[model samples]
Target: PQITLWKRPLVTIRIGGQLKEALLDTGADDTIFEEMNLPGKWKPKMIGGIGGFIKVRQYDQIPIEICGHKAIGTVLVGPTPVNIIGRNLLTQIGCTLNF
Candidate 1:
């Protein structure tokens, strides 16, 4: 074995009057969250993943302000161990893997 270290590129966000962390390590045309807040008429949505490909409420056009920047990003509410941000919204922002 060798000395290995791990890192997470977690970004803090403030939305629905709540604060949370997001990961920029996802590949898709949708956004994701950990069953956060914000009211919407979200129906049942399905997605496949390793952590847990389960049900998701694709809250279309969720308004959220970015922590570092004074910008708002969309949120896709889903109760998953996966906080990966979809490139659709991630691109409106950015990501890093130096961690």
Candidate 2:
């Protein structure tokens, strides 16, 4: 299925039983979400971007539902302007770019 890339390329997703909106960012390698309660052990990691870098809690095999498509992968939780659905999870959903 083809997903329309709107101005923001946003999508609704469910994580840890919570529903939230996230940006479909092809530029990002890993999914990132707002600060939330995440279980299990995590490692401290830093991610660099346009502005700079931010510390994040990296959790592996985090289950997420993107528009009803189920996928389990890593997720970075930290202080972000918005939640991002990166290539890591996008490929699971079979999202391909078309132009």
Candidate 3:
């Protein structure tokens, strides 16, 4: 399946029991989402975003289904504008830029 950039490369993802949407960001190194109650013991950490670095909660070994592809890795929860599937998860899911 080819994804064109006119639509922002958004896709459906399943984290926990809920379905949500997120971006496949090649430029990002870590996955991040808006505030959510994940059954995790998070560690406070800071990561850079659109403007600058923001404080975020880091969770490890989190299971996620990206467009029905399953994997377990790290995830960050914060007040981000939208959910993002970064390089870590992208690499795990074999999502490569084919342009």
Candidate 4:
């Protein structure tokens, strides 16, 4: 299956039993969520992005459904400008770049 890359490349995703829209950012390495109710214990992690660095709660093995694609992995929760579906989850959806 192929996914078209729009200017914003937005997709609907389910995380922690909540539905939200997220931007598919190929440039980003980690999936970041805006404010969410984190269930389990998470450690503090610093993430660097377009606007310098920010601390986030790194939740491991979190289950997420992205456009019907099921993936269980780490998700960073914090005050992100927008919800981003990074390469980490993108790979799970079998997205590839070919020349």
lDDT of 3: 0.90
52: Cα error in model 1, Å = 5.9
| TM-scores for all predictions | 0.70, 0.94, 0.93, 0.89
lDDT of predicted model 2: 0.92
Off by over 4 Å in 1: 1-6, 26-28, 70-74, 94-99
Residue by residue across 1-99, what tens digits does model 3's lDDT show?
567888788999999878999999999899998889899678999998568988999999999999888979999999898899999999998888876
Backbone clashes in candidate 3 total 0
Q: How far in Å is the alpha carbon of 62 misplaced in model 3? A: 0.5
lDDT of 2 by residue, 12-40 (tens): 99997799999988999999999999997
- After superposition, which runs of candidate 3 have C-alpha atoms over 4 Å from their true positions? none
- Per-residue accuracy of model 1 over 1-99 as CA lDDT, tens digit each: 111236665667666677777765555667678876567676677888666577877766666555555434455677777565666665665543343
Q: Worst lDDT window (10 residues) for model 3?
A: 1-10
Instruction: Report the C-alpha lDDT of model 4 over 37-84, residue by residue, as the tens digit.
Output: 878889999999675998899998989998888998889999998999
Clash counts per candidate, in order, are 0, 0, 0, 0
